């Protein structure tokens, strides 16, 4: 059941709406386990240095996951969630509920205080995801679909966001990609080229804004990104699921029998 | 939207049951209109003399259809049905209901009284359908499916029946094919070869039996076929429908754009 | 209650979804009556020769509308609809239901048989709409909104289509604009520039495809456009309404009174 | 998200009723925290000595609030309420309920017994609110609305009441303003001028009346104000809420792109 890396799939439901398979839920679980590409469900010539970054980031995320795996109850569904711009994972577990800020880029006054091996671990993670998106887009271009006009990149926004955060804590393409979660596929297929213009001044003074609402029972902090149009968008939760894969098995038919051979009447 | 002749298609529905597209409902309508293969929704090298028989039978069925088209009301859905062994078509029409015995082979005491042109018309029809089935089976062998074990030939039984009727009013393959409407696909894919054995005696004395039930309000006549096992099966009605084809259009994508060309960061 | 020509407006509803006001329903009614710009609900320096084309097309559409106005019953809501690519209007009328193919460009084997005054009338209509869209887009750029990322050009597709039809029966911009009814606003605000590439070959052989489905009770004809990606889209109905304008009246306040004048205590 | 001080806002709801935003709920919370104007959600030239009184009163209210903050449970919505004429705040708190008489002016036989710093604190509070109302009214005059005829000052009555209490425990404008909670906006916009006449005799003998009803389970005390018409009104509870502010963010669009530049056909 192997597949190319960074893939997506399209499935139909009707009462003919399609839905997309991301390559993330499984990707998240793989990074949870530190699993290596060989023992994965996964033609990568144009993917330079893919494996070393892959497995280094897999291990780094593996121990980070273990950091909270240690506390987990035996007894204590799966509805993993992600938050921009510190790109934090969110879990739940019942008897029959935690988080981790994978890439905190909002404020880091430990540029040299944090050890360089940890920094390289995060850099490996962010580059891995960067190339993962590059693969996902190559995949989009490689095969077009009837349903290319029905959905948007919207899931992947925060990852691109994390990219630009590193950019400030070290671009035009990834930024403007992030700017439109609602952006459609074949559009990008058309105008990957001229995505060049804000020019310098709206990002020299912070890429994002931070606002807290004093809800009188707490302090709902929130991050408010600004996009190259010079505009803004609130960051929002996005609960995940993952489709229960079909039992279907490959036909792999070998008989390929001839029919003219049989002495049919005429 | 062209396709190969004699095709079938497989469609999924779930609350993952598949259903088959026959190539008959459309085929019936085409024979209704006498339409020629060029102006059809339809790689036929192994189909000898296909076109001349095709269009001759199309015309013959066209006038036969007109025989009852003349009487039809303007105002007076579509639920066409077929009956073995005279292979009769059945129509309905409402304001917002007839039949025709296309190939009556039960009793014909007009072997020379019926003109030879009419006889050639029916022979063209029966051969056309014969090759149509041969194509359908070549199609089955050409592409196998996950769902090859889920359905049977059951729709096409009466046509094979009509074949054997001509055989008596002029075989092993088509007979035994007809014998099992419940017969599965890939089985035939396996054992097309040895389908040879009843030997002479159960068919010298009539291929079928005829029984009428005196239901006290009418005489329900019925034909009871016997199969090479030396067994029997009652012939049954089979109401038809036809799926409302999807609006889907061919992507026919031409851009096939490169991606390494864009100056992505790394 | 005057407004600039070719305008749009944005209105909120919630149980904060916005909806757009087109400038079409009213525009359609104005062309129905042949009304001139002076006696309209409507800063047009950059609109060359606007009035002469405006009123000529208004008159032409007025008589064309009268062509079916003559037959209308006294007694016999309003749910006007439009169809590409002949860009036909659709009406209904009850006691307490027609159409007209305004710009038939699918097939016209009367290039010189049709008088030149009629041809100039249609050309005036199509240019009028062309500039109307140019104004609509200037309007989009002039004022951006919070909700610029929530809707698409989708209403106006067929008009752009009619444009390209004239192009064949005499471009890159209007074509690619039409190609994406789902296209978002501020995107166009960004990349109006580089919209240049199919190159010659997919449009030399017909801009559109025509397919009829033999639904066994009729012949549902349909037109299937192809877009610069080399892809396709089915053309679809779009029922219209028009919001019942609010009773609101301009405050136009004139008092602008001072307050420090009153002998407030401190 | 800064705004001018003492503001109000107008919001629409329909099944087009408007509602007003006060500048009080937030103001109450700010005085709860002793917050200073700089770190507030808030062009004040005509506001003399605003900041010193602002922050002094903020601190005074802050400790007064702390007086009951000390007792509050950790675990133990928000429905703050105010009562004239001692202008007392009212709170509630649940697991998942107190008051404070901010400006008791009904009876104070401690004119010199109460220290002068406390007295200056209350005087700062009352002047702060006095100017706050003056700003609110300047705001009303500065921008008029369609809905100026749909609501009344009714929320702010008790504050004006507290004013007149100080007047006795040290006017025509603030008194008559208080006299009509049901008074409409643009009226005041018209006749701020001649609000002069009861003349001396109905207020020399107490501004208000006090009546207790022996409800046989308690003593429901109540204060009964008298207005310059020589009439009366019972003082009433007014439960508060505060709208959950919209997530909306400022567009702050910067592109302001030209359109004639693109080589549109005509």
Residue numbers in the entry:
A (entry chain B), B (entry chain C), C (entry chain A), D (entry chain L): 5 to 19, 44 to 70, 74 to 107, 111 to 130, 155 to 228, 238 to 264, 269 to 337
Paper excerpt:
Using an integrative structural approach, the C-arm was found to be dispensable for P9-1 dimer assembly but essential for the formation of pentamers and hexamers of dimers (decamers and dodecamers), which favored RNA binding. The multimeric structures of P9-1, resembling the ring-like shape of hexameric helicases, and its ATPase and RNA binding activities suggest that this protein participates in the equimolar copackaging of the viral genome.
The full-length dimers are settled in a parallel mode related by the respective 5-fold and 6-fold rotational symmetry axes holding their C-arm protrusions as staplers, as previously reported for the octameric arrangement of the RBSDV P9-1 crystal structure. In this way, the C-arm of subunit A interacts with the neighboring (−1) dimer, while the C-arm of subunit B interacts with the other-side (+1) dimer. The nascent portion of the C-arm is sandwiched between the β-sheet 3 (hairpin βF-βG + β-strand H) from one adjacent subunit and the loop βA-βB along with the helix αV from the other, while the distal portion is partially embedded on the surface of the latter nearly aligned to the helix αIV. Analysis of the final scattering curve with OLIGOMER revealed that P9-1 decamers and dodecamers were the predominant species in solution (fractions of 87% ± 1% and 13% ± 1%, respectively), with a small contribution by larger aggregates.
